[PDB]
Amino acid sequence: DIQLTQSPSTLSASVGDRVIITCRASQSISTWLAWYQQRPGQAPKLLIYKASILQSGVPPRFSGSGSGTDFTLTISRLQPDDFATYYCQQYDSDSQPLTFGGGTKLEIKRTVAAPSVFIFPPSDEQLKSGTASVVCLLNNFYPREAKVQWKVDNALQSGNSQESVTEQDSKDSTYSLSSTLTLSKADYEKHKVYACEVTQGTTSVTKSFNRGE
Amino acid sequence: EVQLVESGGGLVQPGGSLKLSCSASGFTLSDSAMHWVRQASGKGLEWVGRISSNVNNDATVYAASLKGRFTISRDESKNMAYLQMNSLKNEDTAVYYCTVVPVLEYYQYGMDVWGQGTTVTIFNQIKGPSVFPLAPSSGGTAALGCLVKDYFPEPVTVSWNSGALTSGVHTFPAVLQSSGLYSLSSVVTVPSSSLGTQTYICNVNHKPSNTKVDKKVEP
Amino acid sequence: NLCPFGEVFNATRFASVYAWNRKRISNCVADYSVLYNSASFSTFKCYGVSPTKLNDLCFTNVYADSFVIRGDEVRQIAPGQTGKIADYNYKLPDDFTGCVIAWNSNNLDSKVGGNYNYLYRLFRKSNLKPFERDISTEIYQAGSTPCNGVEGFNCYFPLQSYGFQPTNGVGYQPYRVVVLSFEHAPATVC
Ligand SMILES: *[C@@H]1O[C@H](CO)[C@@H](O)[C@H](O)[C@H]1NC(C)=O
């Protein structure tokens, strides 16, 4: 079998910059390599075939090269519609399996944006079921990298929280993150102060609320 | 006007069976080779198998990971291609694509015709979602939403005011909790002056359980 | 390693002209020109490389295309000419470096009432670019009125199935055509 490794897994760039994407193979495949692009919730388009020749209809800004084990996909000029995920595939024989790459998610670069932080106490409806859920919302921030921590009565909590992050917005290009802290109702009524701390670089913002208020 | 339509996906108990059908329109599927490609939620493309042309006697090759559970067939009378699956398990929960690409058959020029995909979901139990309100936190703008907890299997769709409110809405991807059920959040940012006047309703739909929940988020 | 030439020349079931077959040749030592002695091929014309010193050369890569034409279209498998076969089904570049082979298959691809399993494209909106395959069975729009997918007045099916009875002249007889194109790379084919 032959495994394809794409480097890097993800990178960021603005509009109109040259970007390289490398796809390395285990065994030498000669020139049987193809390139794909996949927009969210969409079927992949074929972009490059045989590692060098362009498909009919795709703009000339795309360019591919390589032979043997080293292959490259190049965008001479980035454009808003080319910001999606890319995959490399090898043909290499009519009798042995065919494989895809890990993918290369191409995202935009924008200005640093601070998140609007909100904290959400568990609803009285959920408390009657016996479980409390405290939610933390991080709205419209950039870069995606952030440190979210949970404090209960000024005690650092660990292992009882799950994080979800939205895909990058198509309008203002920012990210949104949710942090859900789950604990038993008996534990929720045992403590008073619940806080959510977000650390981005040299700044850390903490939103909190008092139980029963 | 060359199209590829697939069907047959749905809920499947682990270890069961399912058959998919990729119907060709505008051209004869028997002349070119047909490829089956699957992709899990948020994951990468995974090549499944390939059927050859009728001339090449319909050669079948499958991936090593799919040992003895997958079989590709076709029907020249109906101009359709088939995908057989046995011994199903969670690796197979993915979106399956039928595609006809003539270049991977070592030709020179061709066309990349693809299908729309058919979601195959493997479930052990069916559980409906519980919807709790995220009470507004109120300044100029406030944040409110709905928490969708303890449902299985995927997916759920959240709308606000039956689709009327869409600006400033962020519905997060589901997270698999330790209990094995999925959890999800959906939030919207609205002006704080409209909190007492405008009503806010979230609409959660869970097709596998045929459940639809409408929650009124109020201070 | 011997080459699987019998998988292409001696294949059981053969492709049409609008949907010509394809087979890639690599990683083998190939016995060219030994086929030249066999009496079945009525045409063995080669271009650029003489058909006698084929064994004394090696090429980075080889392409084989197999299909079935009729009679007076064997001269159409060549560079630099026009016609229904050349312009709508299979086109050859002017700078062609390879060979063209065709032989009679009277007892295989022909039946008394007619073998209607072999097709060819007779309608097309543009010419066939060199080395291109057309598979679209979409209805050709011959007039100003849109076809809208129903075939009728000024709306004709693009393909026509070869009539092909063995009792007709050999100008209509089966002629299975095998085309080899010769192009870094490993030892490749020798
Ligand atoms: C096809 O079969 C005949 C009879 O065995 C044989 O002589 C010929 O070499 C075969 N064709 C090829 C290309 O080997």
Side-chain angles (χ1 to χ4, degrees), chain A residues 1-127 129-170 172-191 193-213, chain B residues 1-206 208-219, chain C residues 3-28 30-190:
Chain A
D1 257 314
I2 289 175
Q3 186 204 123
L4 277 303
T5 326
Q6 278 184 240
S7 76
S9 167
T10 207
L11 64 89
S12 201
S14 321
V15 202
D17 321 277
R18 263 175 62 73
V19 174
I20 294 184
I21 296 148
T22 278
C23 174
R24 203 139 270 135
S26 279
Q27 309 210 177
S28 177
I29 69 84
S30 173
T31 166
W32 313 119
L33 199 129
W35 287 104
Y36 291 105
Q37 100 164 333
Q38 164 136 55
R39 315 213 155 118
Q42 219 198 51
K45 172 162 48 163
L46 171 59
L47 253 200
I48 307 325
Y49 47 112
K50 212 172 159 188
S52 178
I53 319 95
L54 213 49
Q55 178 29 244
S56 178
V58 317
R61 61 158 104 82
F62 284 81
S63 162
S65 211
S67 280
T69 303
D70 161 277
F71 305 85
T72 87
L73 214 179
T74 281
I75 304 270
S76 318
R77 284 94 43 189
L78 255 46
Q79 275 227 294
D81 76 90
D82 319 306
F83 280 98
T85 314
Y86 296 79
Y87 298 83
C88 59
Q89 176 198 26
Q90 47 94 11
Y91 337 150
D92 209 59
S93 93
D94 317 319
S95 53
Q96 284 308 78
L98 288 76
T99 42
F100 278 97
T104 309
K105 190 142 126 193
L106 190 50
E107 257 153 342
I108 38 182
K109 211 183 307 143
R110 70 148 276 161
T111 332
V112 165
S116 325
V117 184
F118 310 86
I119 196 162
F120 286 119
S123 64
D124 269 330
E125 197 188 338
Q126 199 199 9
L127 268 309
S129 95
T131 282
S133 280
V134 196
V135 194
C136 197
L137 186 267
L138 275 58
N139 210 27
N140 307 134
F141 61 94
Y142 188 86
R144 176 179 137 131
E145 286 42 79
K147 178 129 152 279
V148 199
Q149 298 172 302
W150 279 102
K151 295 223 193 150
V152 173
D153 276 343
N154 204 36
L156 188 283
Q157 225 81 348
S158 156
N160 54 352
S161 62
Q162 273 145 51
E163 253 174 61
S164 184
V165 52
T166 58
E167 217 63 346
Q168 171 159 42
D169 199 343
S170 266
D172 75 334
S173 161
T174 55
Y175 298 95
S176 268
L177 169 145
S178 90
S179 184
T180 325
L181 173 97
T182 40
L183 46 91
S184 76
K185 166 183 193 186
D187 191 30
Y188 179 68
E189 312 283 341
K190 179 174 130 208
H191 300 106
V193 154
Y194 294 82
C196 175
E197 165 164 343
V198 182
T199 295
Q200 273 220 319
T202 46
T203 322
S204 34
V205 191
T206 292
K207 239 86 181 203
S208 76
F209 72 91
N210 304 287
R211 190 210 80 242
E213 309 265 8
Chain B
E1 323 204 308
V2 169
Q3 336 208 335
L4 273 188
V5 195
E6 327 149 52
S7 60
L11 294 326
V12 158
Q13 273 274 326
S17 271
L18 182 154
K19 204 167 316 272
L20 312 145
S21 60
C22 167
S23 297
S25 175
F27 85 108
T28 291
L29 199 63
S30 255
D31 301 326
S32 274
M34 189 266 327
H35 278 277
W36 274 111
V37 152
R38 77 155 173 207
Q39 153 157 58
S41 198
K43 284 332 165 261
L45 281 181
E46 178 162 358
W47 194 79
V48 200
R50 177 226 38 224
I51 220 65
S52 313
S53 147
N54 227 342
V55 188
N56 293 48
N57 275 215
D58 289 12
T60 88
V61 303
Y62 310 126
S65 31
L66 329 168
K67 174 257 186 225
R69 339 171 315 145
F70 280 41
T71 317
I72 302 190
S73 29
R74 53 209 321 266
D75 176 309
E76 351 85 289
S77 156
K78 317 183 163 178
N79 202 23
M80 304 181 341
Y82 287 14
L83 216 173
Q84 202 309 315
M85 302 181 190
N86 319 322
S87 299
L88 288 323
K89 178 38 48 54
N90 279 350
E91 314 83 280
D92 317 316
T93 306
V95 167
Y96 289 77
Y97 291 98
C98 86
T99 176
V100 188
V101 155
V103 180
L104 312 196
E105 276 58 36
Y106 298 161
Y107 287 62
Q108 211 98 231
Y109 326 108
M111 192 134 160
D112 52 322
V113 54
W114 288 79
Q116 81 296 297
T118 326
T119 297
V120 153
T121 317
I122 297 184
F123 76 104
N124 45 92
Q125 42 150 0
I126 302 268
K127 181 113 156 83
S130 313
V131 184
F132 310 107
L134 306 176
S137 36
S138 56
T141 203
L144 54 100
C146 285
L147 167 65
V148 187
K149 198 169 126 263
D150 293 344
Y151 70 88
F152 195 84
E154 299 222 65
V156 294
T157 66
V158 187
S159 91
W160 283 97
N161 288 345
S162 311
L165 171 57
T166 41
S167 69
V169 173
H170 292 110
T171 283
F172 295 80
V175 283
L176 187 80
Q177 327 177 69
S178 46
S179 45
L181 323 161
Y182 284 96
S183 214
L184 178 140
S185 327
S186 169
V187 294
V188 50
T189 35
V190 294
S192 53
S193 49
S194 84
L195 273 197
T197 85
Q198 167 77 76
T199 211
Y200 292 101
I201 273 294
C202 76
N203 320 114
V204 190
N205 191 75
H206 193 227
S209 70
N210 281 90
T211 318
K212 211 263 212 304
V213 202
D214 292 337
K215 196 33 146 151
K216 177 135 153 214
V217 189
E218 25 185 50
Chain C
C3 233
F5 296 143
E7 209 196 333
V8 160
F9 278 121
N10 287 358
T12 63
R13 269 160 227 160
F14 260 58
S16 191
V17 152
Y18 78 111
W20 37 279
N21 173 332
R22 185 83 152 185
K23 177 60 172 301
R24 251 236 162 211
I25 310 83
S26 173
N27 201 20
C28 96
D31 214 15
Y32 328 123
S33 73
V34 316
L35 304 324
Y36 219 99
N37 307 343
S38 210
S40 210
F41 329 102
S42 91
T43 309
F44 215 121
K45 187 170 284 187
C46 294
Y47 306 63
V49 159
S50 95
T52 38
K53 73 141 180 74
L54 314 163
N55 32 302
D56 297 354
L57 196 169
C58 304
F59 278 97
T60 167
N61 235 2
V62 159
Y63 287 179
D65 329 325
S66 47
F67 31 99
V68 153
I69 69 110
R70 71 137 156 81
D72 50 303
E73 312 163 332
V74 193
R75 61 175 161 270
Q76 268 291 36
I77 303 316
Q81 75 276 40
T82 206
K84 255 34 173 304
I85 276 275
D87 317 336
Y88 291 175
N89 284 267
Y90 196 139
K91 182 64 192 180
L92 256 205
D94 313 327
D95 205 304
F96 173 102
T97 68
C99 292
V100 164
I101 310 172
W103 68 91
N104 208 256
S105 35
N106 199 326
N107 48 4
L108 304 126
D109 312 338
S110 211
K111 204 30 181 43
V112 273
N115 202 282
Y116 285 73
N117 288 252
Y118 289 89
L119 278 294
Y120 86 94
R121 182 168 318 273
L122 176 142
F123 299 72
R124 201 150 129 78
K125 179 166 209 254
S126 104
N127 282 313
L128 199 286
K129 286 198 222 160
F131 218 96
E132 165 180 0
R133 193 152 160 255
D134 201 314
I135 205 183
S136 101
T137 62
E138 302 169 0
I139 306 290
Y140 174 109
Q141 199 214 139
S144 45
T145 71
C147 271
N148 274 345
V150 281
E151 67 110 341
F153 165 102
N154 256 279
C155 279
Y156 328 119
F157 193 82
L159 300 195
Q160 201 287 313
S161 182
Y162 271 175
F164 253 59
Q165 314 151 66
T167 46
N168 213 318
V170 170
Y172 298 161
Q173 219 51 239
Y175 259 133
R176 307 185 145 161
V177 191
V178 164
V179 157
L180 295 101
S181 194
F182 283 88
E183 284 196 357
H184 289 259
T188 86
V189 202
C190 270

